[PDB]
Design an enzyme around this catalytic site. Structure first.
Site, PDB file in Angstrom:
ATOM      1  N   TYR A  78      29.128  12.979  92.646  1.00  0.00           N
ATOM      2  CA  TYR A  78      27.822  12.896  93.311  1.00  0.00           C
ATOM      3  C   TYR A  78      27.575  11.565  93.992  1.00  0.00           C
ATOM      4  O   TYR A  78      27.415  11.508  95.212  1.00  0.00           O
ATOM      5  CB  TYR A  78      26.657  13.169  92.310  1.00  0.00           C
ATOM      6  CG  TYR A  78      26.899  14.519  91.657  1.00  0.00           C
ATOM      7  CD1 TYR A  78      26.857  15.669  92.433  1.00  0.00           C
ATOM      8  CD2 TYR A  78      27.196  14.634  90.308  1.00  0.00           C
ATOM      9  CE1 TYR A  78      27.081  16.918  91.886  1.00  0.00           C
ATOM     10  CE2 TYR A  78      27.424  15.879  89.758  1.00  0.00           C
ATOM     11  CZ  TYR A  78      27.372  17.011  90.540  1.00  0.00           C
ATOM     12  OH  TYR A  78      27.597  18.249  89.988  1.00  0.00           O
ATOM     13  N   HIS A 314      21.409  17.275  92.176  1.00  0.00           N
ATOM     14  CA  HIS A 314      22.421  17.595  91.183  1.00  0.00           C
ATOM     15  C   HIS A 314      22.985  16.423  90.399  1.00  0.00           C
ATOM     16  O   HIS A 314      23.628  16.664  89.369  1.00  0.00           O
ATOM     17  CB  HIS A 314      23.584  18.293  91.913  1.00  0.00           C
ATOM     18  CG  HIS A 314      24.302  19.306  91.075  1.00  0.00           C
ATOM     19  ND1 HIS A 314      24.405  19.203  89.709  1.00  0.00           N
ATOM     20  CD2 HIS A 314      24.954  20.444  91.417  1.00  0.00           C
ATOM     21  CE1 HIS A 314      25.085  20.238  89.250  1.00  0.00           C
ATOM     22  NE2 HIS A 314      25.435  21.012  90.261  1.00  0.00           N
TER      23      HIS A 314
HETATM   24  C1  LIG Z   1      28.008  24.419  92.342  1.00  0.00           C
HETATM   25  N1  LIG Z   1      29.337  23.909  91.785  1.00  0.00           N
HETATM   26  C2  LIG Z   1      30.070  25.027  91.039  1.00  0.00           C
HETATM   27  C3  LIG Z   1      30.218  23.446  92.956  1.00  0.00           C
HETATM   28  C4  LIG Z   1      29.121  22.711  90.848  1.00  0.00           C
HETATM   29  C5  LIG Z   1      28.305  23.153  89.627  1.00  0.00           C
HETATM   30  O1  LIG Z   1      26.926  23.315  90.010  1.00  0.00           O
HETATM   31  C6  LIG Z   1      28.302  21.981  88.622  1.00  0.00           C
HETATM   32  C7  LIG Z   1      29.707  21.745  88.063  1.00  0.00           C
HETATM   33  O2  LIG Z   1      30.421  22.754  87.873  1.00  0.00           O
HETATM   34  O3  LIG Z   1      30.031  20.565  87.834  1.00  0.00           O
END
Ligand SMILES: C[N+](C)(C)C[C@H](O)CC(=O)O
Length: 591
Positions: A78, A314
């Site tokens: 992130y 996120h």
């Molecule tokens: C959306 N995605 C699967 C890329 C990430 C997930 O939300 C979080 C994760 O799997 O670390």
């Protein structure tokens, strides 16, 4: 008086992970790439080799940290990722559309939403959340303390997350935004009791009447930009004292509520997916995208037409804790009001103004343009699978999630003629501060299953056997990932440990096979919720899809996304094939 601490995230044995890696490559790399990779993996784990050294470094790390992975993952997934957070990173949630049909109903509902957030917040502030359990074992609750009163902060090299939830005097205000204008709403009385739903309503009406104007610059749309662009516009923006205080109040606010304008027409069958876009990105620079601060960890959205949801930043959050919160909040909103705080004079909520300059105006225009390009490139669809939910696979004594994952594998193969790198998110909450690891849904078991499924020359009995074995193997992988036995974060850790150790990237990570393995054409997550909602996010590669679903008892809510930049992907097409694959698997098992 408390229960023992949770176990710490394990470092898996090197050999166990490299073998799993090699197992996981077989269906997605050529015979020649696989053999090369195996030789590479052999040189890697060689006695006295590069891999053993890197493994001892991770083992060291876990000894020195509460969670050996947490900083690394935060940073690489992130905070050092510099694409817009919008679509690429911040997932959105669409709620069932609410009833309300007039402003009173809209602001009443927002009022109750806010009351519910504040009620949940009591347990947050107190650390009295009922602990969640999995398989009779407790789960880390740490993520619930990273959702309120927090905000991403743009930075020149990388971003940070500010959390004000446990400062000496934590914020008592939320922010509300309406026609791009932001307001600071105090939601607690001087005594520390929360305003009541009715008091919240009265204040929201003031905020509404104070922001009727539609020709104000949408400063918030700056947060939708590339993080390097936004880091630059951010510093410009907050040169002005007033501008700085306004940003500040937004960043510190407990959460943000967006009072959205209604969207354009929409075909009437393209709606559910337009509202999904509204929740994910705002719908456009002429629509609600500037009715937002995308840095804000929690943004609730209440539209004029009844359309509701949220979009969450996120960086420190995951899906399941966010929808636990949401489930709580919605169920609160249907509980009877009990105790009405006595009437009192209420102040005027503060409008958080922005002084715009030609420079800031230019960043805004540039931000509108960038966002337009992103939105135009995003293909998102919402599919409600009505034929069944968890109920059917349960009746077959199969894990419903593994069933769904195999259906998706089958769909993909029927369209593309081969398996692809597939990610499914796994929760590592059994461990202290645990986030996620990767379940790899494409396996030799799934490949054998999908190749056989449409083969006229295979018996039904054979097909059923391979189905049950693919599903059950996937469940096995799922359960291993959740106990810390997957390999993807371990491999990432080995790579980062290399950087720590001052060595070049190991050959196994520069191989052929690893890029293919890390190039997820299918990026997926199951996010179960008591509320009949669905979550969604953009694909993680130009030519892939984002797939997220909420399995209920008798139906499954799915979202699927793709980029228009790649003519070979089509969200709606994958959704149709996925519907058919689920149907075909149930039919096969019931024959
Ligand atoms: C959306 N995605 C699967 C890329 C990430 C997930 O939300 C979080 C994760 O799997 O670390």
């Amino acid at each position: 008086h408390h229960t023992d601490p949770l176990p710490r995230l394990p470092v898996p044995p090197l050999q166990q992970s490299l073998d799993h890696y090699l197992k996981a490559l077989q269906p997605i790399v050529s015979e020649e790439e696989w053999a090369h990779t195996k030789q590479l993996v052999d040189e890697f784990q060689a006695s006295g080799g590069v891999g053993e050294r890197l493994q001892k470094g991770l083992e060291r790390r876990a000894r020195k940290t509460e969670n050996w992975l947490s900083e690394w993952w935060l940073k690489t997934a992130y905070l050092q990722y510099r694409q817009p957070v919008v679509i690429y990173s911040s997932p959105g949630v669409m709620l069932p559309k609410q009833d309300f049909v007039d402003l009173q109903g809209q602001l009443r509902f927002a009022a109750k939403l806010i009351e519910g957030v504040l009620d949940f917040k009591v347990m947050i502030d107190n650390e009295t959340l009922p602990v969640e359990y999995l398989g009779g074992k407790p789960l880390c609750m740490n993520q619930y303390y990273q959702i309120l009163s927090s905000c991403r902060v743009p930075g020149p090299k990388q971003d940070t997350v500010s959390n004000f939830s446990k400062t000496k005097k934590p914020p008592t205000h939320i922010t509300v935004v309406h026609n791009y204008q932001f307001f600071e709403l105090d939601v607690y009385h001087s005594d520390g009791t929360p305003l009541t739903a009715d008091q919240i309503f009265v204040q929201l009406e003031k905020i509404w009447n104070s922001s009727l104007q539609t020709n104000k610059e949408p400063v918030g749309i700056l947060t939708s930009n590339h993080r390097n662009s936004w880091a630059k516009a951010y510093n410009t923006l907050i040169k002005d004292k007033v501008n700085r205080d306004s940003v500040r109040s937004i960043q510190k606010s407990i959460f943000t509520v967006c009072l959205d304008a209604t969207m354009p027409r929409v075909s009437e069958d393209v709606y559910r997916s337009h509202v999904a876009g509204q929740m994910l990105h705002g719908g456009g620079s002429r629509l609600n995208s500037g009715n937002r601060w995308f840095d804000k960890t929690l943004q609730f959205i209440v539209a004029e037409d009844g359309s509701c949801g949220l979009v969450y930043e996120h960086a420190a959050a995951e899906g399941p804790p966010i929808v636990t919160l949401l489930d709580y909040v919605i169920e609160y909103t249907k509980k009877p009001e009990l105790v009405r705080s006595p009437m009192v004079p209420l102040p005027m909520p503060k409008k958080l103004r922005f002084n715009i300059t030609p420079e800031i105006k230019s960043d805004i225009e540039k931000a509108k343009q960038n966002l337009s390009i992103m939105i135009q490139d995003l293909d998102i669809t919402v599919m409600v699978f009505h034929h069944f939910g968890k109920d059917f696979p349960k009746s077959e004594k199969l894990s419903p999630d593994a069933f769904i994952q195999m259906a998706l594998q089958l769909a993909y193969y029927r369209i593309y003629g081969q398996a692809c790198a597939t990610y499914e998110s796994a929760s590592l909450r059994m461990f202290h501060l645990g986030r996620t690891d990767t379940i790899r849904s494409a396996s030799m078991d799934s490949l054998t299953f999908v190749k056989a499924m449409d083969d006229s020359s295979v018996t039904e009995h054979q097909k059923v056997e391979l189905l049950r074995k693919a599903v059950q193997a996937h469940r096995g992988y799922t359960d291993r990932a959740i106990r810390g036995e997957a390999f993807d974060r371990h491999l990432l850790g080995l790579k980062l440990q290399a950087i720590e150790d001052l060595v070049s990237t190991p050959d196994i990570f520069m191989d052929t096979s690893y890029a293919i393995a890390m190039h997820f054409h299918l990026s997926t997550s199951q996010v179960p919720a008591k509320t009949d909602c669905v979550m969604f996010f953009g694909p993680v590669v130009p030519d892939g899809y984002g797939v997220c679903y909420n399995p209920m008892e008798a139906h499954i809510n799915f979202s699927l996304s793709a980029y228009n930049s790649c003519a070979e992907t089509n969200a709606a097409r994958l959704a149709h094939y996925l519907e058919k694959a689920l149907l075909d698997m149930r039919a096969l098992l019931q024959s």
